[PDB]
Every structure is written in C-alpha cells, then in structure tokens.
Design an enzyme around this catalytic site. Structure first.
Site, PDB file in Angstrom:
ATOM      1  N   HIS A  14      -3.687 -13.436 -25.319  1.00 26.07           N
ATOM      2  CA  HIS A  14      -3.093 -14.710 -25.679  1.00 26.07           C
ATOM      3  C   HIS A  14      -2.005 -15.001 -24.663  1.00 26.07           C
ATOM      4  CE1 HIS A  14      -0.744 -17.676 -27.997  1.00 26.07           C
ATOM      5  NE2 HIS A  14      -1.899 -17.957 -28.576  1.00 26.07           N
ATOM      6  N   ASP A  16       0.871 -16.502 -24.585  1.00 28.53           N
ATOM      7  CA  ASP A  16       2.229 -16.145 -24.963  1.00 28.53           C
ATOM      8  C   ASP A  16       2.435 -14.637 -24.950  1.00 28.53           C
ATOM      9  OD1 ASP A  16       2.882 -18.815 -25.279  1.00 28.53           O
ATOM     10  OD2 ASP A  16       2.666 -18.808 -27.458  1.00 28.53           O
ATOM     11  N   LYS A  17       1.455 -13.899 -25.462  1.00 29.65           N
ATOM     12  CA  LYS A  17       1.553 -12.446 -25.506  1.00 29.65           C
ATOM     13  C   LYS A  17       1.462 -11.779 -24.140  1.00 29.65           C
ATOM     14  CE  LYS A  17       2.818 -11.543 -29.525  1.00 29.65           C
ATOM     15  NZ  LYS A  17       3.849 -10.648 -28.920  1.00 29.65           N
ATOM     16  N   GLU A  42      12.032 -13.504 -18.404  1.00 28.78           N
ATOM     17  CA  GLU A  42      10.967 -14.141 -19.166  1.00 28.78           C
ATOM     18  C   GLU A  42       9.856 -14.565 -18.213  1.00 28.78           C
ATOM     19  OE1 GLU A  42      11.578 -18.515 -20.339  1.00 28.78           O
ATOM     20  OE2 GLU A  42      13.624 -17.724 -20.501  1.00 28.78           O
ATOM     21  N   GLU A  55      17.331 -12.848 -14.853  1.00 31.26           N
ATOM     22  CA  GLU A  55      18.551 -12.311 -14.266  1.00 31.26           C
ATOM     23  C   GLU A  55      18.625 -10.864 -14.709  1.00 31.26           C
ATOM     24  OE1 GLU A  55      22.384 -12.174 -13.627  1.00 31.26           O
ATOM     25  OE2 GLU A  55      21.386 -12.796 -11.758  1.00 31.26           O
ATOM     26  N   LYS A 154      -7.352 -14.455 -31.666  1.00 26.20           N
ATOM     27  CA  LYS A 154      -6.421 -14.926 -32.692  1.00 26.20           C
ATOM     28  C   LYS A 154      -6.963 -14.487 -34.044  1.00 26.20           C
ATOM     29  CE  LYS A 154      -4.500 -19.049 -34.875  1.00 26.20           C
ATOM     30  NZ  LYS A 154      -4.651 -20.526 -35.035  1.00 26.20           N
ATOM     31  N   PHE A 223     -15.880 -19.599 -27.118  1.00 25.20           N
ATOM     32  CA  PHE A 223     -14.569 -19.368 -26.536  1.00 25.20           C
ATOM     33  C   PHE A 223     -14.843 -18.471 -25.317  1.00 25.20           C
ATOM     34  CE2 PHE A 223     -10.208 -17.278 -27.807  1.00 25.20           C
ATOM     35  CZ  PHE A 223      -9.756 -17.459 -26.493  1.00 25.20           C
ATOM     36  N   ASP A 231      -2.606 -24.229 -22.473  1.00 24.96           N
ATOM     37  CA  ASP A 231      -1.636 -25.173 -21.995  1.00 24.96           C
ATOM     38  C   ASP A 231      -0.281 -24.523 -21.786  1.00 24.96           C
ATOM     39  OD1 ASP A 231      -3.293 -27.241 -21.384  1.00 24.96           O
ATOM     40  OD2 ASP A 231      -3.102 -28.229 -23.348  1.00 24.96           O
ATOM     41  N   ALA A 232      -0.255 -23.467 -20.981  1.00 23.07           N
ATOM     42  CA  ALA A 232       0.929 -22.743 -20.574  1.00 23.07           C
ATOM     43  C   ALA A 232       1.392 -21.707 -21.596  1.00 23.07           C
ATOM     44  CB  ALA A 232       2.080 -23.687 -20.243  1.00 23.07           C
ATOM     45  N   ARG A 237       7.715 -17.044 -27.722  1.00 25.75           N
ATOM     46  CA  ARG A 237       7.196 -18.136 -28.519  1.00 25.75           C
ATOM     47  C   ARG A 237       6.344 -17.649 -29.685  1.00 25.75           C
ATOM     48  NH1 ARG A 237       5.151 -23.089 -25.929  1.00 25.75           N
ATOM     49  NH2 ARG A 237       3.541 -21.772 -24.972  1.00 25.75           N
ATOM     50  N   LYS A 238       6.163 -16.335 -29.791  1.00 28.08           N
ATOM     51  CA  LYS A 238       5.375 -15.763 -30.879  1.00 28.08           C
ATOM     52  C   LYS A 238       6.276 -14.896 -31.751  1.00 28.08           C
ATOM     53  CE  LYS A 238       1.352 -17.539 -30.820  1.00 28.08           C
ATOM     54  NZ  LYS A 238       1.113 -18.946 -30.376  1.00 28.08           N
ATOM     55  N   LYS A 258      14.334  -8.874 -23.268  1.00 28.54           N
ATOM     56  CA  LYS A 258      15.733  -8.534 -23.471  1.00 28.54           C
ATOM     57  C   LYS A 258      15.907  -7.032 -23.621  1.00 28.54           C
ATOM     58  CE  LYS A 258      16.193 -12.906 -25.971  1.00 28.54           C
ATOM     59  NZ  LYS A 258      16.386 -13.533 -27.306  1.00 28.54           N
ATOM     60  N   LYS A 262      21.135  -6.307 -26.269  1.00 23.73           N
ATOM     61  CA  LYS A 262      21.090  -7.550 -27.024  1.00 23.73           C
ATOM     62  C   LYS A 262      20.839  -7.228 -28.490  1.00 23.73           C
ATOM     63  CE  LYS A 262      20.809  -9.417 -22.849  1.00 23.73           C
ATOM     64  NZ  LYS A 262      20.922  -8.637 -21.582  1.00 23.73           N
ATOM     65  N   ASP A 264      19.890  -8.987 -30.743  1.00 23.87           N
ATOM     66  CA  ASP A 264      18.682  -9.632 -31.248  1.00 23.87           C
ATOM     67  C   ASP A 264      17.524  -8.651 -31.373  1.00 23.87           C
ATOM     68  OD1 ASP A 264      19.483 -12.230 -31.779  1.00 23.87           O
ATOM     69  OD2 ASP A 264      19.062 -12.925 -29.723  1.00 23.87           O
TER      70      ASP A 264
HETATM   71  N1  LIG Z   1      19.214 -12.288 -26.395  1.00 24.50           N
HETATM   72  C1  LIG Z   1      20.117 -12.343 -25.388  1.00 24.50           C
HETATM   73  N2  LIG Z   1      21.442 -12.139 -25.758  1.00 24.50           N
HETATM   74  C2  LIG Z   1      22.387 -12.179 -24.743  1.00 24.50           C
HETATM   75  N3  LIG Z   1      22.205 -12.409 -23.371  1.00 24.50           N
HETATM   76  C3  LIG Z   1      20.891 -12.611 -23.040  1.00 24.50           C
HETATM   77  C4  LIG Z   1      19.791 -12.600 -23.946  1.00 24.50           C
HETATM   78  N4  LIG Z   1      18.609 -12.845 -23.217  1.00 24.50           N
HETATM   79  C5  LIG Z   1      19.018 -12.995 -21.904  1.00 24.50           C
HETATM   80  N5  LIG Z   1      20.417 -12.863 -21.733  1.00 24.50           N
HETATM   81  C6  LIG Z   1      21.359 -12.958 -20.462  1.00 24.50           C
HETATM   82  O1  LIG Z   1      21.403 -14.348 -19.870  1.00 24.50           O
HETATM   83  C7  LIG Z   1      21.082 -14.306 -18.411  1.00 24.50           C
HETATM   84  C8  LIG Z   1      19.831 -15.117 -18.054  1.00 24.50           C
HETATM   85  O2  LIG Z   1      19.974 -16.538 -18.423  1.00 24.50           O
HETATM   86  P1  LIG Z   1      21.037 -17.675 -17.764  1.00 24.50           P
HETATM   87  O3  LIG Z   1      21.553 -18.561 -18.923  1.00 24.50           O
HETATM   88  O4  LIG Z   1      20.242 -18.630 -16.552  1.00 24.50           O
HETATM   89  O5  LIG Z   1      22.354 -17.080 -16.929  1.00 24.50           O
HETATM   90  P2  LIG Z   1      23.399 -18.339 -16.312  1.00 24.50           P
HETATM   91  O6  LIG Z   1      24.015 -19.140 -17.522  1.00 24.50           O
HETATM   92  O7  LIG Z   1      24.509 -17.492 -15.602  1.00 24.50           O
HETATM   93  O8  LIG Z   1      22.613 -19.176 -15.255  1.00 24.50           O
HETATM   94  C9  LIG Z   1      20.833 -12.869 -18.010  1.00 24.50           C
HETATM   95  O9  LIG Z   1      21.637 -12.606 -16.771  1.00 24.50           O
HETATM   96  C10 LIG Z   1      20.981 -11.944 -19.325  1.00 24.50           C
HETATM   97  O10 LIG Z   1      21.959 -10.792 -19.247  1.00 24.50           O
HETATM   98  K   LIG Z   2      12.641 -14.367 -25.052  1.00 22.33           K
HETATM   99  K   LIG Z   3       8.516 -19.722 -32.072  1.00 22.77           K
END
Ligand SMILES: Nc1ncnc2c1ncn2[C@@H]1O[C@H](COP(=O)(O)OP(=O)(O)O)[C@@H](O)[C@H]1O
Ligand SMILES: [K+]
Ligand SMILES: [K+]
Ligand SMILES: Nc1ncnc2c1ncn2[C@@H]1O[C@H](COP(=O)(O)OP(=O)(O)O)[C@@H](O)[C@H]1O
Ligand SMILES: CO/C=C\[C@H](N)C(=O)O
Ligand SMILES: CO/C=C\[C@H](N)C(=O)O
Ligand SMILES: [K+]
Ligand SMILES: [K+]
Ligand SMILES: [Mg+2]
Ligand SMILES: [Mg+2]
Ligand SMILES: [Mg+2]
Ligand SMILES: [Mg+2]
Ligand SMILES: [Mg+2]
Ligand SMILES: [Mg+2]
Lengths: 368, 368, 368, 368
Positions: A14, A16-17, A42, A55, A154, A223, A231-232, A237-238, A258, A262, A264
C-alpha cells in the site's frame, strides 16, 4: 449487549505503508551506527517515484539510495508491471543531515493505551484478523504457494459482538472484505477461491466462521497494475491501522519516521505496555490507559486508567499498581523498552500493537 | 471523577492543512459547475512547490493553477519570506480528469459520531477552544490588529475535568500551548503578551481561566520564515484535529479531497448530525453513535448508540428514536444534508464538527 | 568585404548556467578527493527547486546538499525576492554513486577548434565583449558599486566587420543589448545610465564605440523577481555561448557535467589549444582546426586545419606543424592540459574559451 | 582537397527528442484552435516522469494529459519494460495559461541558413544519412518487419570528402555507428545483421558503401530497458541534430516549444529557404546565408550570402537576387511559410531541414 465493529489493514505494498516502511528503514539504518541519531523524516511516492524528505541529525554514513531501494525490493517490487521496480524507480532524496533518565517530555502531549482479553494478543479481534489476513498473503506470496499474489492489498474485518457485565466479547465474523494486487495470468474465480480457503480459513478461528459469514474477495474485479500510485502514497496517513483499528483513542500522532525521543511514539508504546500488562495480570478484562505529559516535565502529568467495569480493584487502586510498577518518564521508557534498537521497520506494517516480538508487547510482572 | 484531557489544532498555514484546503478547493470548483462531479484528489506541498494529484471524473472547465494559487493567497501566502507566495510557487498538476436515494454504500465501513453538552457546539471544550484559538489569530491577522501574525500556527489546550453521574464536565484550563508564525519586526515579549490578552483571554470563558493556568506561548522561541515546509505537507494527515480532538472514535477515514459519494465523509457527517440532535433534544448529555455500512447495501448495517449513562430513555429506546427520525442511507444523507454544495473548503480547516454553518451541525427536530 | 555578426552570453544567474555550474561544482568536489572520479551528472532547476541527476563512479565523500547550496550562494542567491535562496530552496538529489596515455577515444567523434587574431584572447570580438559585459556586472555586483544588480543577466553584442585578404577585422559595435535582474529600489533611468557608463564603456574599447552605436539596456522594462525560473533551467542547453558565439563550428556536444574522459570536453579543449597556438605562432590569422576520432582508437582519425587564406605556410604544411608539436590522443590531452584538476566550475560560465587562466588557453611553443 | 566529416541523429525515443516532440505537440494542439496562440513551453522527462513547464497565452481548451500521453504513445512507449508507458507515467503539468506584416523582430538576432548540392535535399550527406538511418528503423518498428526494435536510438555517419574548385563532394561512407533500444528476445548477432542489411544498405546509396566501410552496430552491446532515461531528458538540448549536423553555423537558438513569433524559429526557417532556393536555382553549389535582425525593426538588419566560390554571379549580385525575390520580415515569413499551421511536432525529430514536406523546404522560383 450486541453491537458490531469493523477494522481494516493494508499490505506492505500500500502506497502509504511503503512510505511508513521506507521512513522507518532510514531510521533503522541510522540507529545501527548511531543509537542516538536524531531522525525526523518522511516519504512520498507516486508510480516509480519516491521522495525522501526530512531533517536528521546523526553521525553515520548511510546510502539512502540503497536503504530506499532495498525496502522497495523487500516489499516485493522488482518487476515493471507491478507498479514499482526498485532498480528503475526514481529516488529523489531531499534529506538534510547534520552531524553533532530524567530528560523531560517534548511537546505537551496525551498518549493512549488499550488492551482487551478477547484475543491472546490483547488486541481487538477485528483488527487482529485484519492484520493477520494481510500477513498470511505476504507469506503465501514469499513462499511461492500463491505466486500470483502482489504486494498491495487491503483488508476489512467486521465482527459481531456482545458485552458482558464488563466488556466486549466477539461472537462471529459477520463479513470479510479483502482486495489484493495480482498478476495477469490468474482468473478472478481462482483468486477468490484461494482467498477463502488458503488465507481466510487458514487464519480465522473456526469458532468465528459461519455459514452466513459474508465474503467480498476482489469486489472491484481486477487489481493488476494497481501498484503504488493510489494517487500518491504518504507517511503517517495510516494512523488508525497502526494502532487499535478504531477501538481505543487516538490523539493524532504518527509513528513512522520519528525516533525514540518523540513522545508520540515512545509514550504510546509505553501506554500500550501498561495496558497489556494490566489485563495480563488479571487486573481487568479491558483497559484504556491515558497518559498525559507536560512540555519540559519528565514525570507524566497525570495518568488515567479506564476500565469499563471489568476490574475488581477499582480505578485509583489500579493507578497505584501502575505507579508502583511503572516509571513512564521518556528516558526510562526508551531504556526499559530498548527503543534505540533498529526494529522500527517491522513496526511500520501490519500494526504496531499486537505482535509479541516488540518490547512493549511483553507484559511486565506487576507486583500489585 | 477527575481526569485531564488535551487536544490540538492547526492554522490555515499548516502544511497538512494547506493540502486539505487545496484539495477541497478543487472539490468546490467542480461542484459549482457539475454537482455530480466525482472528485478524488489530494495535495502535497514543500516550500513553494505544490503537487496536485488525483482522479476526478467531471464535466466542468477548471483552471487548477487558479484554484491552487487562489487558495494559497486566501491562506495568507503572498510574500516571499513567509515560506510561500502564490505568485511564485511551483504548482505541478498531475491530475487526471475524465468527462462522463437507494444507491448503496461503497466499501464496508464503520462511521462514528460524537456529541457532549459541555459546550453550546456539542463538542469537547478542549478541541473547541483549540480551534477557536487558531480562528481568532486568523481574524486579527486579516483585520490588521496583529499584522505580525502569519498563516502557520499550532494550538494545544488541556482542560481538567470531572465526571457527573453520567459524564464529562470541564472545570478549568490547566495549560495552553500556542505557536504561530510571524514577521521579523516583532519581539518575543510582545508576541507572548498579545497571545495572552488578545487571543486567549478573548476566546476562553472567564470561568475556565485561572491564576494557575499555564501558558506556553511561542515555546520554541522564534517561528519566522517557518511557513508551510515542515518537511512535506500532506492531505488527510490531520485526521484527529478534523474531528473530535481524540474524544470520540475514529476508523481512520480522511475527509478532504473526497466527494459526497464516499461514505467516509458523508456518513461521518450524518453520524455527527444524529449525535448532536440527540443531546440537543435532551435525550442524553453525551453520545457516541456508531453507524455501520455493508458494501452494496444502502440501508445502514446496524447502528449503535452509546450514551455513558447520561440518558433516561435507555439504549434501544433511543435507537428507535433514531430509526424514526433518521434515514441514514448514503443517497438520502447527501440530499438531506445538501452535500452537493461547495462548502468543503471551509470545512478543510478549524475542524469539520462544531461550526453551526454546516448542514450536519443543525440539530434535527426529533419527534421521539 | 563587409558583413555583420551578433553573439550572446548570460550571467551566472541564468537558469541554464546555474545548472551548468552546479553540475561542474559536483565534478570539482569529486576531483579534489579522487582525480579519477567518473562524473556524468546534470542539473535541472525551477524556482527554488534544484534537481541533481546523474551517474558518478567515484570514491570520495561528498555532501551534495552542500555543493549545490554553496554554488547557489556563490552565484548571489541568498535572499527570497531574488528568485532563489540557497538556504530555503529544494535540493532534490537523485544522484547514483558507485565506488570502484594510449587509452582510446570513446564514441566516434568530431571536435572543432577556432581562433582569430581580432582580439588578444584569439576569440571573436562579438563573443568576447558579450562575456566581458556580463563579467563586469558580476564584479560591480560583488564589489558593491552597483548593489541593485542581481545574478541573472543576458548580453548581446553585434559588431560590423570587414574582411581582409585573409579574414575578419572588426570595425565598430553596431548595437548592444543587455538585460539584468535587479532590486526594486532602483529606477529604470538609473539602471540604463549605469549600464552605459559603468559597464559598457568600461569594457568596450573606445575604437569600437560610436555616436551611432545602438544601446538597448533593459529593453523589456523591469526584471525584478525574474530569478531562475525561465521556465526550467537545464544543463548543456547553452552550447554556443560556452564556445565561440556561433563563429566556429559545433557538433552539439555539451561540456558541463562531464569529466575529462569524455572526448566532447577534452578534445574540444585540445582543438582550441592548437588553434590558439597556430595564430599565436604567426602561422595564420584565423583557423578552424577539425579533429576527428574513431571509437576504440587513441590516435586522432584525421585532423584538418582550416585557414581562410590567412596562412603563408599552406594547409598540409601546417598539419605537419601540428603533428610535430601536438599529440592529441585523449590520455595525453588530459595529462598535458592537467584535466584532472577541479577548474571546471569557473569554466561553467562566461565561456570555456578565451580566458587565459585555463590550460588550453596557454599557447604551445610550436617549433615549426 | 580531402577531409572527413561526421554527423549524428537520434530517434524519437531519445529523452531530449521526446521533450522536443511533447513541447511541439502542445504547440500544435494550440494552433489548431487558436492560430495566434502564444506558445513558450518546454518539457523535462526522467523514467516515467514528464514535467511540462511553460507560459502560453492562448484561447483554446487543451487536455495536456492527453497531448503528452498521446505523444509518448506515438513514439512507441506503451509497455513497461521499454522505459516508458503513456498509461502509467507521471505527467506533472506546471504550465501557466492565460487567455487574451510589418510587425518588428523581437530580440536582436542573427540567423543562419545553409544548403549544398551534394544531395537532392540540399543538406550535408552526413546528416541526411544519419537522419534517414533513424527514420528507417522507425518504419521497420511500426511496420512489424523488425518487432524487436524500440523507440530510443542514436546514429552517427562519417563520410570522406573532397573539395572541387568550389566545394564539398562526398566520396564514401568511412564508418557508421548505430545504437538502438531493443526487446530481450533477440540476439546481438541478429540485431547487427538486420542493421546492416535491412537499415543501412536499404538507405545508403551503393555509390557510398565500400568493402572497407566500418560498421559499429550496437557497440556497447545491449540496450534493452534503456529507453528515455539517460538521466534526464530536456527540450532544446539537441540543437545541432535539428539543423545541419555541424556544417553551417549556429547561434544557439532552440526551436521546439517556441511559436512562430520567435525569430529563432521562423527566421531560421526563412534562411534555410533562401539557401535551398539559391542552389536549386543554379546560382551556387553551396551557400551560407546569414540574416541579421534588430530588435524593434521589421526589415532584416543586413543579410549576408556566403558562397564558397561556387557561384558565378558573385556575392552582391546574389544579394540583390535575394532582395528582389525575398521579403524576410518576420510577419511576411510566417505568412509565406504558413507558420501558423500545426506541423511543428513532425519537425521535432529527424531534423528540421531536409524534408520537402515543410514550407521552407520548397524552393522559391527566383526570377534573378
Ligand atoms: N513527532 C515529532 N515530535 C517532535 N519533533 C518532530 C516530530 N517529527 C519530526 N520532528 C522534528 O522536526 C524537524 C523536521 O521538520 P521541520 O518543521 O521542516 O523543521 P524546521 O521548522 O526547522 O524547517 C526535524 O529536524 C525533527 O527533529
Ligand atoms: K509521520
Ligand atoms: K490519518
Ligand atoms: N559526453 C558523454 N560521453 C560519454 N558518456 C557520458 C557523457 N555524459 C555522460 N555519460 C555517461 O552516461 C551515464 C549517465 O547516463 P545514462 O544513459 O542514464 O546511463 P544508463 O544508460 O546506464 O541508464 C553516466 O554513468 C556517464 O559515465
Ligand atoms: C519553532 O517552531 C517551528 C514550527 C512548527 N511547530 C511547525 O512547522 O509546524
Ligand atoms: C548501451 O548504450 C545505452 C544508451 C544510449 N546511447 C542512450 O541512452 O542514449
Ligand atoms: K550536458
Ligand atoms: K542548445
Ligand atoms: Mg515545544
Ligand atoms: Mg509547519
Ligand atoms: Mg498535529
Ligand atoms: Mg560507444
Ligand atoms: Mg537515451
Ligand atoms: Mg547527441
């Protein structure tokens, strides 16, 4: 107290995956040479075109072309007609890479944790079956048993339930919907037959299959060249298929791409951990643990346990059990759960929760 | 029965929200000339680079460059340093466009609906405040009051609660975190002051603001040239901020970019409708209506009402009330809710639920 | 025997030239750590979006983000409104990099060489002035003298000629057309004045400027945010401005992005070398040396010298002079001309021929 | 006065030529509905990824997806393994389209024209054969005769010459190098055999083929999945193969993608016209007509005829013949040559000069 529920899952093919996996593959590739690598990347894909953005502050030498193409190969995209070929696809890398216990939680947050005893995995039957259904297809694909099977798929599983002076007991599989990519030289009748006998009946417990169970195998017909376009494809997104299939609660935070710093990701894993531990320890049959954090503060800013009257101990007896058995501070979480290890790619598909091979899926003792 | 909760929201400048808006803008642009246009598109953006992808079967003449650039202009991206300029950004359109009551629900599905009487909108206080906080900033931006304010922003509101022999009563705003993009010629001290007096205190009810309420205004310091970059904006990636802020339940279906024929959008709106109608009709103080559909079948495949003991009628008394007041079939939903109307772009930001200007937010009578 | 001629040149900011430079910058970056690096890359740009493509077999660690952004910075793109900012532009790297005297010319080929005594550089006056005109503007830009001057520019110089019992003698500059990007705070009248006094009159010999000479300074009005877009910049698309301004002959081979092993670059340099050497040695006033190669063969497959009756020696007296003074085999060329040195970026703009700082521009002795 | 010469050409599948064609296809598509459409576009391609850029002021409804995909189909890219499939490739359109006799030449310019009687086409034998060689392969590809033949190809023809008290007489084909893409199921021995008997010997006049003529058919071995990749296809990068194969003179102006109002195209066609007319009228055996224009002025700013002593009339006898038979003003050129007609796509490959089916290739009477 009857009610029905549905959940879904997608294969490694998929769109997204694929991005979720590629993003985590880049995370693994860095952890192997620098366990403190700061990863925030990403991926975006669209028909033989993969864009790696991000980054990442790390100190390891990585061949992004290699890690992206290898991941696409692993998924099963080696031939042209499949909609992706790791040898020919465009891998545009726009990645920016630098070089240089009581930490403190980044970003105000609220993570959720969920567990139920309806299955040995401590996960909703609906989402477990949905995942296992896709898992089996990948096995038959990689084994050779079903050589017409392609990466993208799916799955949807809807099970009829009934409460029980506490909560949630599955009764039977009402209907199953499964769509999978395929090769040209294979009839729609042969596919639907294999899906019922070799995949569905080989994973779904007899107790749940019925004479009325509804099957929707390859509903939309063929399929074939439906390779990763959809479509990208995109990362993060999942969100629901990566968690509980819409059974617990979700604040909206994505995992893939991440690193362990983080909240999250880490804290969400930790919350699942305690939830699974609680039910495993017989302290409840169904829990929704809610852990909140305050930006700057290390120690969690209030944790709430939500049993649905399935516990005998009583919320704020179970909270002390959690406070005496768990130290949910960010740094401790990564240490206890071994979150600096490169296991993130296998976490990028078929769900983050459920599989016992993950640290957070190993129930803690719980001394009460 | 104390517990705390947090929710978040993002401004019109947030990368993901720009895509949600652009995608819905293309949806509106088609509905205006062909109310039966089949729209299935998504957007991806990254520093002055917007990619429009999608498959849309319609019969209307649209200037995608115009609809994308106009949407970016509306958001407030007209100058260079802001991280986006509708006059200079790259709009790559890879869009594919063709030309040519008891319908039947596409794709097995399970939609959720939620409502609570803690606010006049019948939405969680935490998410309502989070949205309104961003809304106010856009007003001050567009009015001129705060001319240093830029499109991209993020908001988080955490409120302390307490149950009530039924459910959920907000007590006070524990902490508020708000980050907004800005111009260079404005001090961090002046920004934080304006955010507290002109935005927060101008939207948050006195009853909830405290002497202990924690404020985190522009925590990470500056956010000047930030803009819509955050290494890669995407459509459908802000699933929770578009709904209930993590309070109801979510199957994972995205709204933006999909027309009214997709049950993911329509049925979700319908479910919110009945939920809001129920509490408004005094039949409960908090509901979680669950509507399931079967692929091919028009009439919903089992609807479940989930009050938290806040109703006197009793589930399966309220179900008949719903079955006698509502006809949740896909086709009827679009007709009753006027879903062929181009209102989708304004739905693409600040949340889909809550605002009364949307059909599904107008409570139905409910004859009981 | 009167006739007129026109030639053109572009500044370092021209979209195509930015790509030529970036491509050669990547070539330099590799030669510095591996003089045997096999480089074959090209660049594409479009409003804050740079795409690096290519196949390069080398053994050196290069930060492509750094080499691309540094090149954009060097050119003068540091601010937003200029149409490019090395700190914010998208650098998508889709580059593929591997690791591992009587050679033999690759690919059947035919290289040309040209020289004329109308200027000390041994290059057509028309193209020399065209280049120098752009060079001066970059100086005034980098010095501070003309701070409104921006990177992107275009120059055209048309000079009236007259033959001379041999060939080509410039008489006067008929007309000059120059367009340069600029800042907002500078009047069209002030720009045109500075272009005539500070750039044109400071580079064009008094002998050629007239009272009738036509000047077209900023003909199209304002060229402000006209930064590198020009509907997509590309590498190898400015083939004639990199050579003789349409005076010699050109087979169509591009230079930028190709290493010293490609006869398209090396042999072309070698041919210019001998041409310049011949006129410098008084053996002719104007020559068009033509060197042909055969795939597999090292020694050139027939070299032809084309004087226009400006030589006293006689073609096939001059050929022996060349055969006794030059060894145009590929490998020898790179050795004699020091083609493994990273000087390619400075060769990527303002012309490959003419400037004495390049090996091939240093006349060989010629023992006759 | 012996010397040798080489020229090259590429098939419709060559990356650069695909872009030249797609760009001209968009030009044709506009001329058909608005003969005054202002077209200025270019294309970039890279493995199933086509980018359409440009600024076109026209009033016609065009489906760019259709015109791009149709052009790729025409070329022969319908299957996956060929390196391009019009049904699956990414067509990113970043095109900007607006709506609303003694004109005056835009941009200072200097166009060249060339013709020689060595062939009936009045074009150099070397480039004519090079083109015809590729043309024949396309025929055999489209007919079915050689079904293993694929779109991308490259051709080089080197012929040994000898002057003649005037100029240029071909003696024999020294060597021929031809590379063509192909299907997997075809041996290198069978390909090389077909190339010599069915393509080379079927197009090259017996008079020129020898027992010593060197053949290099598929030199680099296989060229299967090659296709249009060659890391990045571009428009206007094949400037010499579109003209005289390095025989005349070239100022550097590209044709493809530019409408009839650009002197780079129109005037170049006009110059070829007069050149072909002159030799056809027996006024010379070889000419290099040079037409110069002044920005703003309609009437050409000095035209120079360059015979190589092959004319009896004498330059400035022939100039009056041209001035009495031709009106090279921009507007008149487009009217006389019917340049508002959509014939540009067929001009985008196999050379702009030579083929009689083009207006500028029809010799004018010339009353002397
Ligand atoms: N879930 C998250 N929680 C905190 N920071 C995150 C998370 N996911 C990515 N990042 C951080 O955000 C940065 C990438 O996004 P970006 O907003 O373009 O940086 P900038 O605002 O300096 O351009 C990375 O350098 C990374 O450490
Ligand atoms: K993400
Ligand atoms: K979502
Ligand atoms: N002027 C040139 N002469 C010969 N080879 C070149 C030239 N410019 C680039 N190359 C080579 O061609 C390759 C890049 O183009 P490409 O055609 O995509 O390779 P492939 O056909 O294997 O996909 C490089 O690996 C480089 O060595
Ligand atoms: C300094 O904080 C910056 C950015 C922000 N949270 C965003 O890109 O969404
Ligand atoms: C093996 O030769 C390959 C390719 C070819 N000259 C091209 O891409 O143009
Ligand atoms: K090149
Ligand atoms: K060119
Ligand atoms: Mg923070
Ligand atoms: Mg952002
Ligand atoms: Mg968010
Ligand atoms: Mg070769
Ligand atoms: Mg090629
Ligand atoms: Mg070529």
């Amino acid at each position: 107290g009857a009610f029905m529920f549905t959940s879904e899952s997608v294969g490694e093919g998929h769109p997204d995956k694929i991005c979720d996996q590629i993003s985590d593959a880049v995370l693994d590739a860095h952890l192997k040479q620098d366990p403190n690598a700061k990863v925030a990347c990403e991926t975006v894909c669209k028909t033989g075109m993969v864009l790696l953005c991000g980054e990442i502050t790390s100190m390891a030498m990585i061949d992004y072309q290699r890690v992206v193409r290898d991941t696409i190969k692993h998924i099963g995209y080696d031939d042209s007609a499949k909609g992706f070929d790791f040898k020919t696809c465009n891998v545009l890398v726009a990645l920016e890479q630098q070089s240089p216990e009581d930490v403190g939680a980044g970003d105000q947050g609220l993570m959720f944790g969920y567990a139920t005893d309806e299955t040995e995995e401590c996960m909703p039957l609906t989402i477990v079956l949905a995942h296992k259904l896709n898992t089996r297809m990948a096995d038959l694909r990689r084994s050779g048993v079903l050589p017409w099977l392609r990466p993208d798929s799916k799955t949807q599983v809807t099970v009829q339930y009934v409460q029980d002076n506490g909560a949630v007991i599955p009764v039977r599989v009402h209907t199953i919907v499964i769509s999978v990519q395929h090769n040209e030289d294979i009839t729609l009748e042969a596919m639907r037959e294999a899906l019922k006998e070799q995949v569905i009946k080989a994973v779904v417990p007899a107790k749940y299959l019925d004479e009325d169970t509804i099957y929707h195998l390859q509903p939309s017909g063929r399929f074939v060249i439906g390779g990763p376009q959809g479509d990208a494809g995109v990362t993060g997104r999942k969100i629901i298929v990566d968690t509980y299939g819409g059974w617990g609660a979700h604040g909206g935070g994505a995992f893939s791409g991440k690193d362990y710093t983080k909240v999250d990701r880490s804290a969400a894993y930790a919350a699942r951990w305690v939830a699974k531990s609680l039910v495993k320890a017989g302290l409840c049959r169904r829990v929704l643990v809610q852990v909140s954090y305050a930006i700057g503060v290390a120690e969690p800013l209030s944790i709430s346990i939500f049993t649905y009257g399935t516990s005998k101990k009583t919320e704020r007896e179970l909270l002390e059990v959690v406070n005496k058995n768990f130290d949910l501070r960010p740094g401790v979480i990564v240490r206890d759960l071994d979150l600096k290890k490169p296991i993130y790619q296998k976490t990028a598909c078929y769900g983050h929760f459920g599989r016992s091979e993950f640290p957070w899926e190993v129930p803690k003792k719980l001394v009460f």
